[PDB]
């Protein structure tokens, strides 16, 4: 679903 990427204080993940 769109939306990954490491960041520091937040990290997203969905590999879709």
């Given at each position: 679903?769109?939306?990954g990427?490491?960041?520091x204080?937040?990290?997203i993940?969905?590999?879709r």
């Open positions: 679903g769109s939306r990427f490491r960041f204080p937040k990290i993940r969905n590999e």
